[PDB]
Design an enzyme around this catalytic site. Structure first.
Site, PDB file in Angstrom:
ATOM      1  N   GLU A 331       0.811  -1.212   0.000  1.00  0.00           N
ATOM      2  CA  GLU A 331       0.000   0.000   0.000  1.00  0.00           C
ATOM      3  C   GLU A 331       0.847   1.266   0.000  1.00  0.00           C
ATOM      4  O   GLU A 331       0.343   2.337  -0.354  1.00  0.00           O
ATOM      5  CB  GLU A 331      -0.936  -0.011   1.211  1.00  0.00           C
ATOM      6  CG  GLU A 331      -1.995   1.080   1.213  1.00  0.00           C
ATOM      7  CD  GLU A 331      -2.983   0.933   0.075  1.00  0.00           C
ATOM      8  OE1 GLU A 331      -3.243  -0.213  -0.349  1.00  0.00           O
ATOM      9  OE2 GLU A 331      -3.503   1.963  -0.397  1.00  0.00           O
ATOM     10  N   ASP A 373      13.893  17.550 -36.224  1.00  0.00           N
ATOM     11  CA  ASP A 373      13.824  18.138 -37.555  1.00  0.00           C
ATOM     12  C   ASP A 373      14.864  19.254 -37.660  1.00  0.00           C
ATOM     13  O   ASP A 373      15.689  19.447 -36.764  1.00  0.00           O
ATOM     14  CB  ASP A 373      12.410  18.641 -37.846  1.00  0.00           C
ATOM     15  CG  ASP A 373      11.402  17.514 -37.942  1.00  0.00           C
ATOM     16  OD1 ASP A 373      11.812  16.339 -37.849  1.00  0.00           O
ATOM     17  OD2 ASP A 373      10.198  17.802 -38.106  1.00  0.00           O
ATOM     18  N   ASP A 641       6.436  19.794 -34.544  1.00  0.00           N
ATOM     19  CA  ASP A 641       5.239  20.585 -34.290  1.00  0.00           C
ATOM     20  C   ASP A 641       4.454  20.902 -35.559  1.00  0.00           C
ATOM     21  O   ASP A 641       3.740  21.910 -35.597  1.00  0.00           O
ATOM     22  CB  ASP A 641       5.604  21.884 -33.561  1.00  0.00           C
ATOM     23  CG  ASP A 641       6.625  22.722 -34.315  1.00  0.00           C
ATOM     24  OD1 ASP A 641       6.571  22.788 -35.560  1.00  0.00           O
ATOM     25  OD2 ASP A 641       7.492  23.326 -33.651  1.00  0.00           O
ATOM     26  N   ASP A 645       2.451  15.663 -38.415  1.00  0.00           N
ATOM     27  CA  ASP A 645       3.197  14.741 -37.557  1.00  0.00           C
ATOM     28  C   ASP A 645       2.358  14.275 -36.372  1.00  0.00           C
ATOM     29  O   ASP A 645       2.778  14.344 -35.219  1.00  0.00           O
ATOM     30  CB  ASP A 645       4.488  15.397 -37.089  1.00  0.00           C
ATOM     31  CG  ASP A 645       4.261  16.777 -36.511  1.00  0.00           C
ATOM     32  OD1 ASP A 645       3.093  17.210 -36.455  1.00  0.00           O
ATOM     33  OD2 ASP A 645       5.250  17.428 -36.111  1.00  0.00           O
ATOM     34  N   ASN A 709      14.481  -6.302   9.887  1.00  0.00           N
ATOM     35  CA  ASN A 709      13.759  -6.399  11.153  1.00  0.00           C
ATOM     36  C   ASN A 709      12.929  -7.674  11.224  1.00  0.00           C
ATOM     37  O   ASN A 709      12.893  -8.345  12.264  1.00  0.00           O
ATOM     38  CB  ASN A 709      12.867  -5.172  11.348  1.00  0.00           C
ATOM     39  CG  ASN A 709      13.601  -4.016  11.990  1.00  0.00           C
ATOM     40  OD1 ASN A 709      14.827  -3.928  11.925  1.00  0.00           O
ATOM     41  ND2 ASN A 709      12.852  -3.119  12.621  1.00  0.00           N
ATOM     42  N   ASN A 734       7.388   2.429  13.102  1.00  0.00           N
ATOM     43  CA  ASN A 734       7.111   2.563  11.676  1.00  0.00           C
ATOM     44  C   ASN A 734       6.568   3.947  11.349  1.00  0.00           C
ATOM     45  O   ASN A 734       6.934   4.540  10.328  1.00  0.00           O
ATOM     46  CB  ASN A 734       6.131   1.481  11.227  1.00  0.00           C
ATOM     47  CG  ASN A 734       6.788   0.126  11.082  1.00  0.00           C
ATOM     48  OD1 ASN A 734       6.317  -0.867  11.634  1.00  0.00           O
ATOM     49  ND2 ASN A 734       7.883   0.079  10.335  1.00  0.00           N
ATOM     50  N   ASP A 738       8.337   6.616   8.856  1.00  0.00           N
ATOM     51  CA  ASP A 738       7.630   7.197   7.720  1.00  0.00           C
ATOM     52  C   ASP A 738       7.659   8.719   7.776  1.00  0.00           C
ATOM     53  O   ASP A 738       7.793   9.382   6.742  1.00  0.00           O
ATOM     54  CB  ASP A 738       6.191   6.688   7.681  1.00  0.00           C
ATOM     55  CG  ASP A 738       6.095   5.250   7.216  1.00  0.00           C
ATOM     56  OD1 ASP A 738       7.153   4.604   7.056  1.00  0.00           O
ATOM     57  OD2 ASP A 738       4.963   4.764   7.012  1.00  0.00           O
TER      58      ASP A 738
HETATM   59  N1  LIG Z   1       2.462  25.308 -45.548  1.00  0.00           N
HETATM   60  C1  LIG Z   1       3.223  24.279 -45.931  1.00  0.00           C
HETATM   61  N2  LIG Z   1       2.850  23.033 -45.565  1.00  0.00           N
HETATM   62  C2  LIG Z   1       3.607  21.999 -45.943  1.00  0.00           C
HETATM   63  N3  LIG Z   1       4.730  22.005 -46.664  1.00  0.00           N
HETATM   64  C3  LIG Z   1       5.077  23.249 -47.013  1.00  0.00           C
HETATM   65  C4  LIG Z   1       4.397  24.414 -46.696  1.00  0.00           C
HETATM   66  N4  LIG Z   1       5.047  25.519 -47.224  1.00  0.00           N
HETATM   67  C5  LIG Z   1       6.085  25.006 -47.836  1.00  0.00           C
HETATM   68  N5  LIG Z   1       6.168  23.641 -47.752  1.00  0.00           N
HETATM   69  C6  LIG Z   1       7.213  22.802 -48.336  1.00  0.00           C
HETATM   70  O1  LIG Z   1       6.797  21.447 -48.286  1.00  0.00           O
HETATM   71  C7  LIG Z   1       7.851  20.619 -47.747  1.00  0.00           C
HETATM   72  C8  LIG Z   1       7.459  20.138 -46.371  1.00  0.00           C
HETATM   73  O2  LIG Z   1       8.412  20.627 -45.404  1.00  0.00           O
HETATM   74  P1  LIG Z   1       8.086  20.623 -43.860  1.00  0.00           P
HETATM   75  O3  LIG Z   1       7.832  21.988 -43.357  1.00  0.00           O
HETATM   76  O4  LIG Z   1       6.957  19.626 -43.609  1.00  0.00           O
HETATM   77  O5  LIG Z   1       9.399  20.005 -43.227  1.00  0.00           O
HETATM   78  P2  LIG Z   1       9.826  19.367 -41.834  1.00  0.00           P
HETATM   79  O6  LIG Z   1       9.691  17.898 -41.847  1.00  0.00           O
HETATM   80  O7  LIG Z   1       9.056  20.108 -40.742  1.00  0.00           O
HETATM   81  O8  LIG Z   1      11.340  19.816 -41.723  1.00  0.00           O
HETATM   82  P3  LIG Z   1      12.266  21.065 -42.064  1.00  0.00           P
HETATM   83  O9  LIG Z   1      11.315  22.092 -42.676  1.00  0.00           O
HETATM   84  O10 LIG Z   1      12.962  21.546 -40.839  1.00  0.00           O
HETATM   85  O11 LIG Z   1      13.218  20.553 -43.145  1.00  0.00           O
HETATM   86  C9  LIG Z   1       9.110  21.476 -47.813  1.00  0.00           C
HETATM   87  O12 LIG Z   1       9.750  21.345 -49.077  1.00  0.00           O
HETATM   88  C10 LIG Z   1       8.559  22.888 -47.611  1.00  0.00           C
HETATM   89  O13 LIG Z   1       9.390  23.864 -48.228  1.00  0.00           O
HETATM   90 MG   LIG Z   2      16.479  -2.925  12.414  1.00  0.00          MG
HETATM   91 MG   LIG Z   3       8.769  21.459 -39.155  1.00  0.00          MG
END
Ligand SMILES: Nc1ncnc2c1ncn2[C@@H]1O[C@H](COP(=O)(O)OP(=O)(O)OP(=O)(O)O)[C@@H](O)[C@H]1O
Ligand SMILES: [Mg+2]
Ligand SMILES: [Mg+2]
Ligand SMILES: Nc1ncnc2c1ncn2[C@@H]1O[C@H](COP(=O)(O)OP(=O)(O)OP(=O)(O)O)[C@@H](O)[C@H]1O
Ligand SMILES: [Mg+2]
Ligand SMILES: [Mg+2]
Ligand SMILES: [Mg+2]
Ligand SMILES: [Mg+2]
Ligand SMILES: [Mg+2]
Ligand SMILES: [Mg+2]
EC number: 7.2.2.14
Lengths: 898, 898
Positions: A331, A373, A641, A645, A709, A734, A738
């Site tokens: 527990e 990335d 981000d 993804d 113990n 105890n 604790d």
């Molecule tokens: N609004 C957008 N959405 C998606 N792709 C885009 C957009 N504008 C441009 N791109 C192009 O599409 C491709 C997708 O890139 P993305 O931004 O997804 O890359 P990533 O995986 O985040 O990595 P990094 O950009 O750091 O190389 C790239 O060639 C980028 O230049």
């Molecule tokens: Mg002891």
């Molecule tokens: Mg990116």
């Protein structure tokens, strides 16, 4: 084995603090057809006119007052899953009071010490009550503090409502859980859909319905239906579903369902089952609890039989056995876990490393591969140079204006190029162009094309089709080049010249983006992807984003700590290799995304361990490589981000993200950084390892002494004609231990157990508790002999002196061994402890030593102590403390302290 | 009263802790009569052959053993100015014991209490001894700690010596104060000359003797004299002097004179005279002491006369007068200053803001203008892009090699350009060029020309004159342009084309550096500045260093605190304006350094207040502008680390520098940052402001209460027929109060007194002490009346009760008023205090309360206390503690708390 009771003697932490949230919006697209009731209800809800929705709910396009909203919320419910609702506090107090060990102890105390010693039963009840109260208070405070971090990074929605006095509207932001059916919200670009909606007005909205169907390409949404027949609930072109995102355009809608009554809940069967999955942590905790309960059940009945056969008081013997064995109860584990992880979570929150659920700390400090990335992580994302040149290599002042229109009449997510283009042109030309043109239509961005277009018009004569994107994706469609101020057909040598000039523009960190346009007559329909054909190329735009200053030291620290960094980018391969070389990272040999498409799993699993850089990857390649990188035993973390993804974050063993990103990228994450960088992550990894390093110590130092113990009681009580210590003394010992242990989560950890990705072995406890247990037993039996013979003892008439002496020496030995087995080095001269732990130890020591010489001693069936006992006590204590320092060497030579 | 000379009751802090070092290497080149003996000795030294300096000293070109060096150092002295030597600790103890107040108190105690009670004299001596011992320990520990930060940033020097003591040379680095005469050192480029030297071998060395002669041009240094006659001690071409740097080349010399026997000592008259200079701090510390001593002499004799006229024991009256007045002693100031500044210095050392002397903290938190330089403070100082183009705009691949030759055969300071050019060529070409050419000569860099030239030959037929520099400083000399592969004469239109193309290259952040070569026949002499005539221009190199990421937040924070930032650059006026725009700093109008050369002092003073940018500045302009920005009364700080910013760092009110810079830049600075940035400085400014607030509080909350006690005694001792409190009780009260106050320099300062460039006014202590003083007299006389009437006292046979009561209430009131006159908010709910201060207050309170009820009480002439005065004590204490909270309003509205 088996023993279904063993699954009932183990309490469980709530599934919101240790388990990843089962609802990311999509989860698994199962083949559950579901009853036709919901499909019919949705189809019905997607056909009524505008006026019917006015009366079906109590929606008003002026806001909902603070009275109707509460009534509707109570009538329907809350926008939350059933598993995310906290329990009432009184139920929490009750469940922490009906533990089988506690109830059996209370019942047996009532049975034994009633007819003659009712005061003993009263004090036993008092002791068990104070113990359970301490546990409840600590756990409740920790679990209340741990839920404040979960709501600090929650998604928000823009509701109209009423704010100031009455009918003031406001467009305020509220968390998505405080949503009520019949409420109007507004959607913008890059925004998660909170719940099922009904669009009232539209501005060319596009949503990505790939999390439910898999069409990848965005699907257009409109207020009034344009298709003749729906025939499906997921293609009504009039509603919305949670888990999807808005890719382009703006619109307005009103919610029609919240909570578990929507899609993705009972329709997708998320609530139904899908919970029988222990995520490592829940397996280790279970194994540790099973080990402890096995040892307790082994030890207790032998002592019970011995004390019941030597004497004739069977009830007293059973109660004594239970009191001795209560020190190994499972527990205590929930307190150990929660009260130690919550403090680490708060400390991380102090460093902008906000942690959503507490389990993430275990995997955050035990990872050895980081898959990140390029943009943002390594580069500043703010470009300082750009050249809007022409096809020949001259400044054009026409490509810039033809790219300003495409970056001013688009509603997609803004890039690092759109801001620069908007801030590049002077004010006068911007105003003139704004006054000269009017928007008409828009073709949004979608993958597998890598191209975005917008249709603009000047007068009611013709239309324009300005376009951007990657160089190869416009060079593959264009047919003419505006060269020397005149349109000329594009031949083959001009195609071999651009691919050389722009490749020379690469290898330097410059990215190239092309621009194309086309004159088109007066149309009345809606454009599509296939309209982009036979355009005239104009020029490109080369720009540079410099590396971030705090990048190389972060990589050096990460390499020192053992974490290996791998780059999974989606940009060109000539660029992203110069960037990796400017920051000192060893790019080595690169791998393009086309080669991976025709590789088996066995080949890829061994290829992906000596690459360090992948270029030109679609999200599917990212999701596959992240999954395959966990082959042998490794732990893989993904930091990203974007808008696409979503599966990669869930696939990896951790979901590091950044606050201020797309909502779907934060809904599937586990750790939300408050500032995109790599030094913050590095400084948070150290604290993540350090907090988890305290839990193992806090478990081990508590289990080992209690086992010692119990073994001492088993060995010694056979020959002795009376109980060495009355059970009340053991209970108070105890309790005091604790109380003294509360300061452990505020300890200091040496800088040698953390400079390595650490792996947790639950079976190490069963060895560390056997090697360090009898060391106390030897000195305990020595103290027994010394008090027997030196101090004229072993008389059934007078025995309180023996019990008092053993109580004092046991409390001293238990509390003072903490400072010696907390480190591998020599204590108090190389690795000290934190001041609160020393203060608590001193206070508990004083309270324990002063208890026998108190007026309350007679009440607790205890008496005084002669002044000649002190030197022998000090000698025994010093000898026991010194012996373990010499013994410690042999333990680490076998399998390792940590 | 004046009598400044007569006031010898003011001990002084050592000049090494509060005053800037008077020896920056050159100080002021004042026209002092040169000692003929020194000039004769200097002329005599630089005429002996190589073999005579072998025997004049005991130098051996294999190192000096650890025995000869010690003997020579003890026989000649140490390489240190006489003012920078610590004093023996026993002398420190003695000087803290001969304080006139202490000696008079001891003598008068011996006179009074010796014929009836020797124990009283004994305990008086014990009390004064313990007080002076506490003061000595505090001051000694603080001044020992403060000198550890002064030698952590000391300049080094490469001596040969012996490392293993068996013979291994070593070339180890030692501080410039462990230099023994007759030792051999090696000089490199950018290394201040430690002491007078004697060059043995040379490799075209150059030294900037602009700190002793004003020539402003480098002067060549040789090994065997080539000039026919010296006729001057400063032009012997064979010796070196401290304060001058090495601009180019390498060499190896041998020291001859160290310490005060060198030049710049008795020659420049640094030690003799020029010492009466109080730097603001030494004026405030004097005025505060003057105010305190004036009040003490105002208050003491009236009380003495009153107690000598009411009673008949004149000796007792005088002793009581000094006992009451000892609280306002000026001897406590050195402890207050040192023990509070040392802790701040250590805390700054924990943040890489190493402080050299303790006075810099006073000007580091009181500055409102910061003057800095562009490169390194705003940009990353590493270039990520460069284009070695041609005259017509093509990749020449010839301008690069003509730049590699210049960047590989130079001995000056390396730049951001040279590192890239050395890294911008492939290995094969670099090896071929290194194997094909050989070095001949080198013309070093110097201002007013702005170029560098090196002479390189391949075969013994001709040579080359590849030259680098600014575009205008090379285009002003060249006569031909290597265009289209053929040498074509330069004409006028080709000059109006380059200054347009390269001005378009500017406005973007790119810097332009040109390259020019010349074919020159075989020679045998030495080149000069005028040989750079009629060169052929080849091309330029355009590169980009991006802005640093952590720049905009730093500027926002600095603007929030009130520190206006001004840029004093020496680069082009088109660049350094885009850089300021990229980081967000406003620029407005740009001022060129040529306009300043024709402006008077008033116009420049009223112009330099609204510019924010100065382009194209020579160092003289920098120094003049820094001098003229302190017109109104502002405080101006200069940040810089070049080889020519020697007078600018000293002219400004604070010399902020960077560790790792040129030695002369560090030798003339007050704060040595361990990392060039604008965020470390910002985080250190707050701590600098915060330490001074603690100092001001520690000064203020001590004298006011003592003045209140003196006034209370003066008012209430007339009608009273005996002494209200015996002197021993007052002495122990002061001792306990000091022990409680020890923990003040660890307190929490509110975030409201440090959000403004605060400044100090010593006259506020003469007002805060009058407004808050008598507020304790009312409650003191009320306590007197309450004890006399309610407790049946003022019997001339029993009086110890009165003294005990007043002692207890006075100690309580002194110690418990600290926690409410330390903040402007409401205490304990808006601004608490640090835990160590509370702990010390509680401990002192317990000790004071328990003292009368102790066995030692009767020894100190003090009896017990009935258990009925406690409620009245608590009531009066609460009343006094709560009255000042309401009173505090009317004080700040008059002239201001801070
Ligand atoms: N609004 C957008 N959405 C998606 N792709 C885009 C957009 N504008 C441009 N791109 C192009 O599409 C491709 C997708 O890139 P993305 O931004 O997804 O890359 P990533 O995986 O985040 O990595 P990094 O950009 O750091 O190389 C790239 O060639 C980028 O230049
Ligand atoms: Mg002891
Ligand atoms: Mg990116
Ligand atoms: N070794 C050198 N010593 C001095 N100046 C040099 C040197 N090499 C090149 N220069 C040029 O001489 C001029 C002096 O620049 P300097 O380095 O003294 O500037 P600064 O005052 O430190 O400020 P900034 O941040 O603009 O460089 C500049 O035009 C610079 O390019
Ligand atoms: Mg459309
Ligand atoms: Mg959002
Ligand atoms: Mg020369
Ligand atoms: Mg500089
Ligand atoms: Mg140096
Ligand atoms: Mg007082």
């Amino acid at each position: 084995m088996f023993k279904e009771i063993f699954t009932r003697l183990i309490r469980h932490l709530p599934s919101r603090l240790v388990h990843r949230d089962p609802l990311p919006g999509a989860q698994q697209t199962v083949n559950t057809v579901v009853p036709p009731s919901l499909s019919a209800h949705c189809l019905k809800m997607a056909v009524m006119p505008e006026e019917e929705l006015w009366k079906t709910f109590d929606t008003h396009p002026e806001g909902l007052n603070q009275a109707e909203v509460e009534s509707a919320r109570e009538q329907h419910g809350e926008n939350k899953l059933p598993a995310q609702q906290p329990s009432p506090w009184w139920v929490h107090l009750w469940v922490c009071y009906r533990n089988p060990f506690n109830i059996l102890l209370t019942i047996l105390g009532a049975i034994s010490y009633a007819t003659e010693d009712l005061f003993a039963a009263g004090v036993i009840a008092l002791m068990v009550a104070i113990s359970t109260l301490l546990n409840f208070i600590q756990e409740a405070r920790s679990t209340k503090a741990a839920d404040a971090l979960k709501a600090m990074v929650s998604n928000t929605a823009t509701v109209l409502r009423v704010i100031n006095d009455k009918g003031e509207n406001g467009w305020l932001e509220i968390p998505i859980d405080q949503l009520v059916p019949g409420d109007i919200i507004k959607l913008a670009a890059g925004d998660m859909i909170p719940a099922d909606l009904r669009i009232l007005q539209a501005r060319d909205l596009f949503v990505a319905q790939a999390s439910l169907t898999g069409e990848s390409l965005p699907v257009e949404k409109a207020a009034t239906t344009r298709q003749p027949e729906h025939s499906n609930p997921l293609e009504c072109d009039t509603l919305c579903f949670m888990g999807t995102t808005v890719v382009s355009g703006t619109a307005q809608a009103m919610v029609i369902a919240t909570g578990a009554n929507t899609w993705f809940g009972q329709l997708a069967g998320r609530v139904s089952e899908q919970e029988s999955e222990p995520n490592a942590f829940q397996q280790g905790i279970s194994r540790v609890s099973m080990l402890l309960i096995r040892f307790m059940l082994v030890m207790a009945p032998v002592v019970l039989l011995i004390n019941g056969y030597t004497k004739g008081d069977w009830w007293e013997a059973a109660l004594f056995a239970l009191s001795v064995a209560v020190g190994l109860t499972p527990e205590m584990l929930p307190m150990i876990v929660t009260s130690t992880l919550a403090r680490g979570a708060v400390k991380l929150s102090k460093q902008k490393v906000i942690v959503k659920h507490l389990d993430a700390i275990q995997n955050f400090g035990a990872m050895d591969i980081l898959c990140t990335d390029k943009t943002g992580t390594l580069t500043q994302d703010k470009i300082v140079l750009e050249n809007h040149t022409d096809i020949s290599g001259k400044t054009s002042e026409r490509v810039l204006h033809s790219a300003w229109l495409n970056s001013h009449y688009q509603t997609g997510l803004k890039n690092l190029l759109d801001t620069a283009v908007l801030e590049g042109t002077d004010e006068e030309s911007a105003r003139s162009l704004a006054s000269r043109w009017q928007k008409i239509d828009e073709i949004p961005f979608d993958f597998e094309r890598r191209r975005m277009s917008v249709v603009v018009a000047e007068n009611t004569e013709h239309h324009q089709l300005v376009c951007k994107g990657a160089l190869q994706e416009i060079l593959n469609v264009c047919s003419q080049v505006r060269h020397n101020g005149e349109i000329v057909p594009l031949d083959d040598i001009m195609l071999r010249k651009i691919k050389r000039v722009t490749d020379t523009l690469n290898r330097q960190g410059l990215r190239v983006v092309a621009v194309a346009t086309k004159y088109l007559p007066a149309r009345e329909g809606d454009y599509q992807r296939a309209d982009e054909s036979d355009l005239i190329l104009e020029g490109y735009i080369a720009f540079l984003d410099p590396p971030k200053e705090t990048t190389a030291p972060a990589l050096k620290a990460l390499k020192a700590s053992g974490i290996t960094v791998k780059i999974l980018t989606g940009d060109s391969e000539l660029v992203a290799a110069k960037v990796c070389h400017e920051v000192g990272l060893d790019a080595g040999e690169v791998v393009i995304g086309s080669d991976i498409e025709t590789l088996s799993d066995d080949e890829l699993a061994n290829l992906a361990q000596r690459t360090t850089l992948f270029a030109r990857l679609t999200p599917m390649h990212k999701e596959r490589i992240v999954t395959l990188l966990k082959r042998e035993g490794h732990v893989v973390g993904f930091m990203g981000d974007g808008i696409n993804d979503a599966p990669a974050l869930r696939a990896a063993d951790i979901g590091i993200s950044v606050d201020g990103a797309v909502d779907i990228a934060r809904e599937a994450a586990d750790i939300i950084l408050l500032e995109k960088s790599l030094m913050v992550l590095e400084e948070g990894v150290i604290e993540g390892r350090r907090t988890f390093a305290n839990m193992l110590k806090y478990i081990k130092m508590t289990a080992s002494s209690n086992f010692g113990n119990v073994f001492s009681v088993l060995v010694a009580s056979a020959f002795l004609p009376f109980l060495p210590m009355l059970p009340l003394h053991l209970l108070i010992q105890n309790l005091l231990y604790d109380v003294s242990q509360v300061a452990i989560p505020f300890d200091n950890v040496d800088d040698e157990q953390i400079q390595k990705p650490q792996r947790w072995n639950p079976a190490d406890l069963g060895r560390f508790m056997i090697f360090f247990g009898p060391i106390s037993s030897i000195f305990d039996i020595l103290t027994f002999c010394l008090m027997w013979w030196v101090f004229h003892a072993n008389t059934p008439e007078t025995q309180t002196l023996f019990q008092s002496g053993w109580f004092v020496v046991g409390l001293l030995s238990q509390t003072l061994i903490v400072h010696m087995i907390r480190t591998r080095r020599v204590p108090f001269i190389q690795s000290c402890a934190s001041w609160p732990l020393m203060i608590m130890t001193v206070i508990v020591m004083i309270v324990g030593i002063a208890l026998p010489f108190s007026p309350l001693a007679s009440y607790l069936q205890l008496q005084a102590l002669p002044l000649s006992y002190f030197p022998w006590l000090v000698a025994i204590l010093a000898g026991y403390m010194t012996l373990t320092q010499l013994v410690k060497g042999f333990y680490s030579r076998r399998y390792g302290w940590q």
